[PDB]
C-alpha cells in the first residue's frame, strides 16, 4: 500500500452536474 | 451501474507532499 501522508480519495463526478461526491450516487 | 454523467474517480493525496495522484503510490 501507499506511503505516509497519503490518503486515497475516491469521489464520484457527475459531469452532468460536473459536481463531486464522496459517494456512489443514488441517482 | 452509476447514474448519468457519473463516473467514480479517485485521487491519492500525499499530505506530506500535499500533492495528488490518480493512483495508490508505489510507496
The tally of strands of chain A reads: 2
- Sheet having the most strands of chain A: 2 strands, antiparallel
Seen as an oligomer or otherwise, the chain set is homodimer
How far apart lie the N and C ends of chain A?
32 Å
Overall spatial form of chain A: elongated
State the helical fraction of chain A. Answer: under 10%
Radius of gyration of chain A (CA) equals: 12 Å
Number of helices of chain A: 0
**Estimated structural class of chain A:** mainly beta
Biggest chain-to-chain interface with counts = A-B, 22 and 22 residues
Spatial strand arrangement across the major sheet of chain A: 1-2
Strand content of chain A: 35-45%
Order of helices and strands of chain A: EE
PDB class: de novo protein
Keywords: Hub-linked, DE novo protein
Assembly: dimeric
Entry title: NMR structure of a strand-swapped dimer of the WW domain
